[PDB]
Design brief:
- Chain D: Its EC number is 1.11.1.24.
- Chain D: GO terms for molecular function: identical protein binding; thioredoxin peroxidase activity.
- The structure is a homodecamer.
- Chain A is α+β, with helices and mostly antiparallel strands and 162 residues long.
- Chain A has one domain: Glutaredoxin, CATH 3.40.30.
- Chain A has helices at residues 51-55, 57-60, 74-83, 105-110, 147-161, and strands spanning 11-16, 19-24, 33-36, 67-69, 98-99, 125-127, 133-139.
- The first copy, chain A, has a four-stranded mixed sheet with strand order 4-3-6-7, with no helix packed on it. In chain A, strands 2-1-5 form a three-stranded antiparallel sheet.
- The longest helix of chain A has 15 residues, at 147-161.
- Chains in contact: A-B, A-F, B-C, C-D, D-E, E-H, F-G, G-J, H-I, I-J.
- The interface between H and I is medium-sized, with 30 and 30 residues.
Chain lengths: 162, 165, 162, 164, 165, 165, 163, 165, 163, 166
């Protein structure tokens, strides 16, 4: 894995605002892509920083968009996190698709998923509009992803590409 | 392709959700007793999965021959508990005294031989084992069909009666 | 095995109402099937499996499901166990095809057979009109299966399909 | 590879002697010459029962060691149930000879017998010595029989030649 | 391992003899006639007899039944000629009117599966073949015993009766 | 493919450049403190790696919280010092107090999952590790960017924040 | 590396006199090449042998040869030793092609290389226009050969072709 | 392809005809003296060819020089015996004063490399060995041609002249 | 190897009547050839074995034949045995073809090639114009080859090939 | 195989040489504690025509005065070296040698050092120098139809001696 190449991308089903739509990277290219993984769902109190990405869409959208989220939790769990409200738990709602990744292949491609914990690590890899992977980053379990740095790397890449 | 009964039972490791607390479970952690390891594909569903809780409510009856009815999915633990917390009306199972297991690291499912590989889930089977760790019965179903508790009770009574008799 | 992939096609020599008939899997098609195993011929007293399906066969054919009784015993042996009478400790006159696996093929194909005892244990399989495996059941040597659940599985598979 | 003057393709199986069931091992008949003959199936379509002739000649065999070792690829139950039927009504009536079951087709695959194509064994008559060594091989495939006279003759010819 | 009947018979060709000739004589030469192939360990071996002459004098019985009797040893051609031309008294044969075959390079013996590794001579077996190039009957003995012509005639009668009648 | 930020780390030796001094800098010499290892493609490449030299001035901030700040180009040692010998304005590194490490033999680069095969190239490497041999975080961003000095402190403080409490 | 067999190919960054370039052996036909190897940049030696040779090139290039140079180091770095003053720690401004292999390709190709210090041993090869090198030479690290003798062996190879 | 000259000789074992009787002999039984061992394809003839009998009627030159040459062929013991008991004139060879070694199976001949694939007969050849079991000289010939006794007599004298004198 | 099979072909040059002349097995035919090997050039032991072969050529050619020698030595060594003199360490100007095997291949082919001392054994086999080898015989180090036996085997050979 | 490296141990060799007419087996091990110079050459009698490199052979004492044992090394046998050595320089042959005429008929040492030429079955020219610890300080292969220089070897030897103490 080096950050220049098309990514062994993915095939899957996702949750887009209540509706189930199966997506593949190829449905995107000609547009910038970014993909964040993040651990299993429905965990207790802790920040669930993923929601930060849903409300922050427009900032991502100045060029292109659709940061996705993969988990071994597949369909139903992602739908259940997408529907239920912030007060109780999970994403109050999301204008972004949550990936399936039930078969872990999406994870097994990208170099994530420490084998013994039954799930993946954190996210945020970047893919150019021609489908080439510009950036790789992985975080350990007890930490979150930063929203600002993704936009900084993204914009810097917009300036270096142009 | 598959494995034969009367052979030792396929070992498993995982953690599950008991009466609301947590429990590390291994085949070895519980055997004085015949067990029912019946599977089910995933957490939640669009559809009304009304066979879910059905095995759980009768377990006291299963325990008279020293037995227990366990369920498992390849979905995560937190997902199992969050599914446990829902109401029958709302489509979730009620609060049960039976655990529900999880692979996620692909352990319990791959041992017993159930998988579609496409849905990353179990093929919804039911196995029966003896207290000495050898497998009494294998059954596997398809996704939409369920297992019957009565037939399970018949299999249990017939298999339990033969041991020392 | 698994309830998805195509069924382990077989060519046996069966007993239909006394006469030898070579059958494929494919020749019996468009109406489900139950492929069921039993360990041996001339088992001491009980014909208490086998014939259980024969008296209940009306119920199986009304749902279109056929019934295949198999053993690793030969043709001739099946005819000889069939020709004996129930009172005398025999299958009596059988109105269902007795398959006769003969040598090792069909039993281990379907995945049961035996190592030490060279006989299948006890199977019950369900197949659909297009030849793919619907349901697998195996019990053990000493105990058997009940017919009602087989009928329930059949109806459950039929009502869900359309 | 199976030839004469070789250790015997040992077996066990379960058998039927005079109506009962006894697990037998070749070694129980050690110290004696053996004549092992195979027959394709139990309860065969073709009616003629003729093999029972070897059972009728057993006195002659008892005059010199052995036993007739009637094993076939058929199972235990088939041999016992065909044994329980009578010669008159067809099928082997009763026997002063050991009937062994090959079943899982261990012994047949051992001896070089057991035609794979119809899944039934061939005619397997062979002779062995008291030392567990194979003296004689014969096959004469299914649609024919073995002669008892030639077997006892072969035995007699075989007994006088080793010491002198 | 062992040769199964109803299976095609292993072909053989060589330099042997017939009545003092050294002709070809390959299995393919009959095809439509029964053959009986019987082995014997060596030339100039027992001396007398050895019992092979039993097959030599009654060949008419085989020929009226449509058959051919081939004798064979791992010994050379000239050796076969020298043992055949020799006299009954001195232990030489009776000038066989049937071809006795000599595999010097073996492989005729090893094909049919009769080869003694301990010595390097044959194990003295008896095979019967079909008119269609298919193997019918196999019999093998040990070194010191022998073979009977009557039983062979019995097998012939039975196989011809099943073939034609 | 790449490794994972959980299991231990691919230890290293090399020599160094620290304040002009080498001292061989073995991984084991760096125990007891968090480390941030950052890679860059070449020496005297000053046109794109502007600001990479700017990394030298904020290191105190890294050191007060107990950390290393060490880096490398996977290029030559003496070359790191000789590039370190010029002034920022004059087209030089000025003088950096960060340990500059150099694996001439491209070992460390291939270990960490960097080193683009076609041209000897560390893209831009950045790893974070805990005081004993374990890797906390990985990031690599292609050719052009110089990452950021600021965000790494956020990652460091957060990583200290979850274990400390 | 047999002298009677064709020479291992090379293409690379060049840094011809004063600036930069990209060069391959194949560009040279009817004219020789001299392949020069040497350890890393800016460490210690007043000649690397680069000085005695490159300053004396009038005799070396007149014989149809090139002599170039090669080391394992970054592209910019060869230019950087080229860029500094004769005194102090720089070589001076060298007029000659510098072959920069950071991927160790060319070094490991001619077989002059080691993974210990990741550098190359100082070698000298001579190459004919038909790709037949006729001579192989390698020294150790602390020692050089000489400016004169390489040229002597060279002359021996140059006068001999058709005569 | 050939064993090799000057190399130790390959062990061989078989049975032979000594003074009319049978003795299993190996070179190792002799050692201790120069040995010569030759070969011939088969045993018997209706025509005259002689060859080996030249060695047989006078062994004196060989026995006085400490040699004791052995004859060997691929054929049974009994065949060699049957050729040995006869008279030189009229079809048999003499009474051999050299041990006739009988390769029944494919071993001594195939070992020494004189085996002819085209049949079960060896090529006619002669090897010479020393008291220490090493081969001094290898010689062969095509089958239909022959061997010289005189030259065989000369080479021994040559070896006695060269190794010790 | 084995008789009656075609002989492994060989090519080489060495010394034929003092001059060179690279020769190949296939170019001859029409005559029996006897290829005889000899261990080394310029040996202490007396050469006279081979000398028997050099002076006796009339008879060698009279049998419809050609007698070539062989060594793991090069052409020039054979030249030094040729161009010097019969009397001291050389053998005439040879009326017999010697072999030029430098790379000791031909020795390895015929199955001789002593491995320990890198020298050949006695060689001397035989062939026919139809390209198949009739007879093999080899001695080892000290002893020599006999000419009389070559004449005897030849005489034995003519009656069998002609009749 | 093909490529030898300095600072690496030198491949050890054994063989039978010609010293002053006498044939005696020599081994690398006798030269420990001392520098050795192994110089190759394709064949006897051939090229460059004789004796050319004879320049190195007759003046050897000065080369011998500071360590540095010098070897001959050709694909020919001992006896051949003896016959080419016995002729006088004038007659087109190597003179009477005060240095080892060692060689390999068995292609042992030559194919080891990587100087063996397969096409002409003889080794190429060139040489190697070794240190008292059996380690290779120089490679320098040349070619068959050409020659060497004595000076490069003589000065380089002193430089290599200059590095061990200084």
């Amino acid at each position: 894995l080096l950050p220049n190449r098309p990514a062994p991308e993915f095939k899957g089903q996702a949750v887009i605002n209540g509706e189930f739509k199966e997506i593949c990277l190829k449905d995107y290219r000609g547009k910038y892509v970014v993909l964040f993984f993040y651990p299993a769902d429905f965990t207790f109190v802790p920040p669930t920083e993923i929601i930060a990405f849903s409300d922050q869409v427009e900032e991502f959208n100045s060029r292109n968009c659709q940061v996705i989220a993969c988990s071994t939790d597949s369909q139903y769990s992602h739908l259940a996190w997408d529907n239920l409200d912030r007060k109780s738990g999970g994403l109050g709602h999301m204008k972004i698709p949550l990936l399936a990744d039930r078969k872990q292949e999406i994870s097994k491609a990208y170099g994530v998923f420490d084998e013994e914990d039954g799930n993946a690590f954190r996210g945020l890899f970047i893919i150019d509009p021609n489908g080439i992977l510009r950036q790789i980053t992985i975080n350990d379990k007890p930490v979150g992803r930063s929203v600002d740095e993704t936009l900084r790397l993204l914009d810097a890449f917009q300036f270096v590409e142009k």
